[PDB]
Amino acid sequence: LEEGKAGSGLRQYYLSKIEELQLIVNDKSQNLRRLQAQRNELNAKVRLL
Amino acid sequence: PPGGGEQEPPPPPAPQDVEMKEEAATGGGSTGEADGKTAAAAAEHSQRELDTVTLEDIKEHVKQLEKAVSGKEPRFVLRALRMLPSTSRRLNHYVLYKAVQGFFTSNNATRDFLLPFLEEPMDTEADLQFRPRTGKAASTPLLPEVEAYLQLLVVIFMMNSKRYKEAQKISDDLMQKISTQNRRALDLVAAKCYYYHARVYEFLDKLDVVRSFLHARLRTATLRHDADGQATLLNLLLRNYLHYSLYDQAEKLVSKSVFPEQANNNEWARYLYYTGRIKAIQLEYSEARRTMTNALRKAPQHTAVGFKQTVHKLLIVVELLLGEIPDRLQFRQPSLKRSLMPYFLLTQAVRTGNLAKFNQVLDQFGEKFQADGTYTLIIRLRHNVIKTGVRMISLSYSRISLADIAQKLQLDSPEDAEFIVAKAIRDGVIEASINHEKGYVQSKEMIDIYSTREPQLAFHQRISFCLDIHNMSVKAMRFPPKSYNKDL
Amino acid sequence: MYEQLKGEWNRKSPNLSKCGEELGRLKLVLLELNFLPTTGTKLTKQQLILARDILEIGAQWSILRKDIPSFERYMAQLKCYYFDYKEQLPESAYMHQLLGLNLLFLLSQNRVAEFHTELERLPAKDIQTNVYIKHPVSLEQYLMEGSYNKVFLAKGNIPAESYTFFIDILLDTIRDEIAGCIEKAYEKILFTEATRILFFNTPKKMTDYAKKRGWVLGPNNYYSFASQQQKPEDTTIPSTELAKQVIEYARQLEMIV
Amino acid sequence: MSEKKQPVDLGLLEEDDEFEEFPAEDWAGLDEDEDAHVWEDNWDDDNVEDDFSNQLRAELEKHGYKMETS
Amino acid sequence: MITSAAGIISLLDEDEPQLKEFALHKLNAVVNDFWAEISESVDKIEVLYEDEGFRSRQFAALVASKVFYHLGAFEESLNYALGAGDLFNVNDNSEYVETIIAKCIDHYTKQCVENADLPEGEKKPIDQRLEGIVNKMFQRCLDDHKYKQAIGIALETRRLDVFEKTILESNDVPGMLAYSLKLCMSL
C-alpha cells in the first residue's frame, strides 16, 4: 500500500497548497469587494446628493 | 560572606518573569492564535519568533546560575499532558507544579537530567492533538539554552541533541509533509538549528552526512515552495561552498533558478553577500559593485555595523581594482574604522601608485589582510597598481612623453610604454586614437558624456528600466493595501 | 599486486603504439578495480596511489601525443584521487608538476577565469620555494600585465626541467591572442612597431594573417577600415518600440484598474 | 538568522585584544581635531593631506623661489 | 561518495560502454547528492539514448528522467520516464518514484480528459506501458480499495471498464453505489 497516505497524501497536501491559492483568490475577492463597497458607497453617496 | 550571601537571591529571578511570560505569551499566543484555523492564518508569528530570537541572541542570562540555580532545566511545558479533555485539574496543576519548587528549596542539577528528554514525546508531546506545532514549539526554544556554551565537552551533548531532534521529528519528518504554519516555520527552525550546530560541524568534522542529506531533504522541500526556507537551507550549502569547495561547473550558472520571492528582509543582504562573495573571485566590475553596495546599504533592522564591516571590506577591496576607491564617507561607526586602520595606508596608496615603496609597505606590516588566505586578490593587486595608474593616465592628458610621464610612471622604455598602454586600450573601458606620425603616440581620449550625443538611445534603457522598477514599486504600493483590506 | 608493472613504467619509450596496448591493458585490469575512491579497510591506498601514478605518467604520454580529450580525461580521472576525504594520502613529488600542466591547459584553452578562481587551492604552503611552484602564477600574472618581452627574455631562465617545449606550445597558443590584440587597429598602426612587437622576420604572420584577417596591404603599412563607420539609426524603429513601451505603460499602469 | 554575527564579534574582540586602547588614544590624537567635523570632507582633506605628507606638503613657500627659476 | 568528480563526464563521453555501465551505476548513487554536475553530460546522454546502439535504454532514460525534473520542467523528465521501455522497479517511498508516478497519474488523467471529449476521430496514441504502470499501482490500491479512492480514481481516469472490477469485491454495495452517485452528482 503506502499510497493513500504517501501518494494521495502528497496529492492532498498539494490540494492544501491549492487551498492557499484559493486563499489568495479568496482574500483578493474579499478586499476587492470591500473596496468595491467603498466605491459603491461613494458613488451611491453622490447619488444621494 | 554577607555581601553575596545577603545580595545573592535578588539577581537570579530577574529574567524569570520575562521568560515565563514570554514563553506563555508566544506559546499560548501562537497555539491559542492559530489553534482554530492554523492553515488560514499564516506568517503572523514568524516575525515574532525571529524577533524573539534576535532579541535573545544577546542574553546575559547564564553568568552565575551554575550553582544551585539550574532548576529551570528539569522543568518543561507540562501543559495539558496525558489527556486532551478535562483539563481543569491540570489548570490547577499549572499553579501546583510551579508552586512546589518554591516552598523551601529544590533538588536541581546541570548535566544529570539531559538525555531523558524523550519521555513525553514517546506517548504525548503536549496534548496528542497539536503534536507537530507543540513538539517543535516546545522543544526547539529551550534546547539552545541548555546547549549554550558550546565548549567544555558539550559537543557530545550537542550530538545527543542532534539525534534527539532528528529521531523525534526530522530524521525525515514526523509526518511526511506537515503543510501548515509549523511546516513553513519548521523550514527556518530546522535551518536555524543547522546554523546553530554548524559550528559543531565545521569545528572538527566536515561535510559527509547532513548537508549532503540536505539535497534529498531540499528537494523532497517540495518544488511548490516559496523557496524562503529552501533558500535559507541553500545559504548554509553556499557558505559550506565558500571556504573551500572551489568547483564552479554546477552551482555557478546552474544553481540559478526561477528565483522566487526570497527576501526574509535579511536574505537579500546576507544571501546577496554570499553570491557576491563567490562572484567576487572573477573580478566582477559591473554587477557585484552595484548589487553588493546595495546589499551593504540593506539590512538596517538589527545591526548595520558589526556585520557590514566584512561586506564593506571586500567591497572596497574590489572597488580599488577599478582605480576609483571610495572610502568611508557617510557611515560613522567605530567598527569599520578599526577594521580599516591597517588597510587605510595601502588603500590610500593605491591611487598614488608607487611600485617599489608600497610593495615593501604591504608585506612590511601586512599581517591580517595578507594572512586572510591565498593572497589572491592582493597578489593580483601588486601588478594591478600599474594598471590603475595607467588608468589614471587615461584620466590624465593625452600625449605621452618618453621621459616626463614615463619616468613618472617608473617605466622608462619606448617598447613597453606603448605595449602596456596598448594592453590598457584592448580592455575597452577607455577610448583612444592610436596614431603614429613621427613616433609619438596620440589619443583622442574623448570622455564626453552623452549630452547632445544620441540621447534617446543613451537614456532610453534608463527610462524603461526606471519605469519598470518604479512601476513594480507601484505594484508594491497596490498589493499591500489589498493585504490591509483583506481582513475587513 | 597483480603483476610488476615497474619494468615499462620508468622506461621512456619514444614509440607510443606499445603504450597504447599497455594503456588499454591497464584499462582492462583497472576496469574492475573500482576507479572511484574507496575508503574500505583503508588498505587499498597502495593500489590507488600506484594507479594514480601510472595514470599520471599515462597523462604524461597523453599530453606527449597531443590529445586534448585524453588529457582532460585523465586529468578529470586523477582529480578524483587528488580531491579526497582522507588526508592520509602522501603528496606525490610530481603532483604539483601535473597541477602545473593543468594550469598550462587552463591557460592554453582560454579558460583563464577558471585559473583566477582556481588560485585558491594551490597556495597550500607545501613547498613554496621551488621556481615551478611560483612559475605558473608569475607567468599568468605577466599575462595580466600582458608584457611579452619579459616572457621572451625569461625563456632562458627556466631550468633543465623538460617542459620548456610545453611553454613554447603555450606561446604558440597565445600568440593568436597577443598578436590579435596588438593588431586590433582602432585607427592605424605602422609596420615599424610590428617589426619589434611581432615575431622574427619569418613571413608566417603576414601570410597566414592575410588569409585569416583578410585586410588591405598598403605601401609598407597596415590600413584599418570599418572603424566607427556605422551610420546612426533613422529613429523610426526606436519610436515604434517606444510606442510599444507606451502600450506596456497603459497595460501595467492600467491593468487591474 | 543573525546568529553568524557572533564569530565576527569574536574577531572584533581579538582585534580589540591586540592593542588595548592604543588605537583609540593614538588615533584620538587626530580625532580630537576631527571630532564634530563633517567626515565627508575629511576624505578629500585626508586624501590630499596623506598625498602631500611624503613631500611638498605646503609648497606655497617654494613658489616664491620657483618664480625666477621656472 | 564523490562530490566534484569530473571523470564520469569523460567516461560518459567515451566509447566501449562496458566501462560506461558501472560508471552510470555509480552515478545513480551520487545523483541525489549532486544532480547539477550531470548537466554537462545531459547532451551526450541524449545522444546515446536516441540511437539504438546502447543496449539498456532505461539506464539512460532513468538518469535523464531524474535529472530533468531536478533541472527544469516535469514534461521532459516524463517523456523519458514513460519512454524508458520495460522498467523493473518495485514500490518505494522515495521522492523520485512518488513524483514520477504523481506526475504520471496527473498527466495520465490529463490526457484522459483531453481524449474524453473526443470519442472518435483524431484519437491520440496512448502507450501500453502507461496503462501497465498506472494500472499496476492502481491495482495495488485496489487490493482492498480502502473504500475511498476506488470510484474516485475510477472516475478521474474516464475509462470504461476501470470501475466494473472495483465493484466486484466490495462490501456494502448500496453504500458504494450511493457514494458513487453522490460523488458523481457533485463534480
Short mmCIF file of N, CA and C in Angstrom, two decimals, chain B residues 227-276:
data_model
loop_
_atom_site.label_atom_id
_atom_site.label_comp_id
_atom_site.label_asym_id
_atom_site.label_seq_id
_atom_site.Cartn_x
_atom_site.Cartn_y
_atom_site.Cartn_z
N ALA B 227 10.27 29.03 -1.65
CA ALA B 227 11.73 28.99 -1.64
C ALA B 227 12.34 29.89 -0.57
N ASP B 228 11.56 30.28 0.43
CA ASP B 228 12.12 31.02 1.56
C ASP B 228 12.94 30.09 2.45
N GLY B 229 12.30 29.07 3.01
CA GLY B 229 13.03 28.09 3.80
C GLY B 229 13.99 27.26 2.98
N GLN B 230 13.62 26.96 1.73
CA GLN B 230 14.53 26.24 0.84
C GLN B 230 15.75 27.08 0.52
N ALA B 231 15.57 28.39 0.35
CA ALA B 231 16.70 29.26 0.07
C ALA B 231 17.58 29.45 1.30
N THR B 232 16.97 29.55 2.48
CA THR B 232 17.77 29.61 3.71
C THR B 232 18.55 28.32 3.91
N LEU B 233 17.96 27.18 3.53
CA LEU B 233 18.71 25.93 3.54
C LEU B 233 19.80 25.93 2.47
N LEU B 234 19.62 26.70 1.40
CA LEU B 234 20.67 26.83 0.40
C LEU B 234 21.80 27.72 0.89
N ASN B 235 21.51 28.63 1.82
CA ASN B 235 22.54 29.54 2.32
C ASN B 235 23.65 28.80 3.05
N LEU B 236 23.29 27.78 3.84
CA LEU B 236 24.32 27.01 4.54
C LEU B 236 25.13 26.16 3.58
N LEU B 237 24.51 25.70 2.48
CA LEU B 237 25.25 24.97 1.47
C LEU B 237 26.23 25.88 0.74
N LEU B 238 25.81 27.10 0.42
CA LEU B 238 26.70 28.03 -0.27
C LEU B 238 27.81 28.51 0.65
N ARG B 239 27.51 28.69 1.94
CA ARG B 239 28.56 29.03 2.89
C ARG B 239 29.52 27.87 3.10
N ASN B 240 29.02 26.64 3.04
CA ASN B 240 29.90 25.48 3.05
C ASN B 240 30.75 25.42 1.78
N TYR B 241 30.23 25.96 0.68
CA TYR B 241 30.99 26.07 -0.56
C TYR B 241 31.85 27.33 -0.60
N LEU B 242 31.79 28.17 0.44
CA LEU B 242 32.50 29.44 0.42
C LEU B 242 33.98 29.25 0.77
N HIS B 243 34.27 28.56 1.88
CA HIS B 243 35.65 28.47 2.33
C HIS B 243 36.49 27.61 1.39
N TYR B 244 36.09 26.36 1.15
CA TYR B 244 36.79 25.53 0.17
C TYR B 244 35.84 24.45 -0.35
N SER B 245 35.36 24.70 -1.57
CA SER B 245 34.55 23.82 -2.40
C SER B 245 35.41 23.94 -3.66
N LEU B 246 35.25 25.07 -4.33
CA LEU B 246 36.05 25.54 -5.46
C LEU B 246 35.60 24.99 -6.81
N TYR B 247 34.65 24.05 -6.83
CA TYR B 247 34.07 23.66 -8.11
C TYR B 247 33.00 24.66 -8.52
N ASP B 248 33.05 25.07 -9.79
CA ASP B 248 32.17 26.13 -10.30
C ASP B 248 31.35 25.69 -11.50
N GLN B 249 31.34 24.40 -11.83
CA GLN B 249 30.64 23.94 -13.02
C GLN B 249 29.15 23.72 -12.80
N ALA B 250 28.69 23.64 -11.55
CA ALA B 250 27.28 23.37 -11.28
C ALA B 250 26.57 24.54 -10.60
N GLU B 251 27.02 24.95 -9.42
CA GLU B 251 26.26 25.98 -8.70
C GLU B 251 26.40 27.33 -9.39
N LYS B 252 27.57 27.62 -9.93
CA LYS B 252 27.77 28.83 -10.73
C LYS B 252 27.09 28.64 -12.08
N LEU B 253 26.01 29.39 -12.30
CA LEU B 253 25.21 29.44 -13.52
C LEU B 253 24.30 28.22 -13.70
N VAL B 254 24.37 27.21 -12.84
CA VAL B 254 23.38 26.15 -12.81
C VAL B 254 22.50 26.23 -11.57
N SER B 255 23.05 26.71 -10.45
CA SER B 255 22.22 26.95 -9.27
C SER B 255 21.16 28.01 -9.54
N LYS B 256 21.42 28.91 -10.49
CA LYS B 256 20.49 29.98 -10.84
C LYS B 256 19.17 29.42 -11.33
N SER B 257 18.10 29.66 -10.57
CA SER B 257 16.78 29.10 -10.84
C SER B 257 15.79 30.23 -11.10
N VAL B 258 14.50 29.87 -11.13
CA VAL B 258 13.41 30.83 -11.31
C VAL B 258 13.52 31.99 -10.33
N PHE B 259 14.17 31.76 -9.18
CA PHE B 259 14.37 32.77 -8.15
C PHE B 259 13.04 33.31 -7.63
N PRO B 260 12.28 32.51 -6.87
CA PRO B 260 11.03 33.01 -6.30
C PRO B 260 11.27 34.08 -5.24
N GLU B 261 10.20 34.51 -4.57
CA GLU B 261 10.30 35.60 -3.61
C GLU B 261 11.08 35.15 -2.38
N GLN B 262 12.39 35.41 -2.38
CA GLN B 262 13.29 35.02 -1.29
C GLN B 262 13.87 36.30 -0.71
N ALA B 263 13.17 36.90 0.25
CA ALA B 263 13.60 38.16 0.83
C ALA B 263 13.99 38.02 2.30
N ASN B 264 13.07 37.59 3.16
CA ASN B 264 13.32 37.38 4.59
C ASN B 264 13.74 38.67 5.29
N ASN B 265 13.81 39.77 4.53
CA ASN B 265 14.28 41.07 5.00
C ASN B 265 15.72 41.03 5.51
N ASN B 266 16.38 39.88 5.37
CA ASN B 266 17.80 39.75 5.68
C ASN B 266 18.51 38.98 4.57
N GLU B 267 17.76 38.10 3.90
CA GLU B 267 18.36 37.16 2.97
C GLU B 267 18.85 37.83 1.69
N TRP B 268 18.34 39.01 1.35
CA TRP B 268 18.95 39.77 0.27
C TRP B 268 20.34 40.25 0.66
N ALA B 269 20.49 40.72 1.90
CA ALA B 269 21.77 41.23 2.36
C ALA B 269 22.80 40.12 2.52
N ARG B 270 22.46 39.08 3.28
CA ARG B 270 23.44 38.03 3.54
C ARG B 270 23.55 37.05 2.37
N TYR B 271 22.43 36.69 1.75
CA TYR B 271 22.48 35.83 0.57
C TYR B 271 23.17 36.54 -0.60
N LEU B 272 22.84 37.81 -0.82
CA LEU B 272 23.50 38.56 -1.88
C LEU B 272 24.96 38.81 -1.55
N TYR B 273 25.29 38.93 -0.26
CA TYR B 273 26.69 38.97 0.15
C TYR B 273 27.39 37.66 -0.14
N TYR B 274 26.66 36.54 -0.06
CA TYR B 274 27.27 35.24 -0.35
C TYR B 274 27.52 35.08 -1.85
N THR B 275 26.49 35.30 -2.67
CA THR B 275 26.66 35.17 -4.11
C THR B 275 27.59 36.24 -4.68
N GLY B 276 27.72 37.38 -4.00
CA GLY B 276 28.71 38.36 -4.40
C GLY B 276 30.10 38.02 -3.92
#
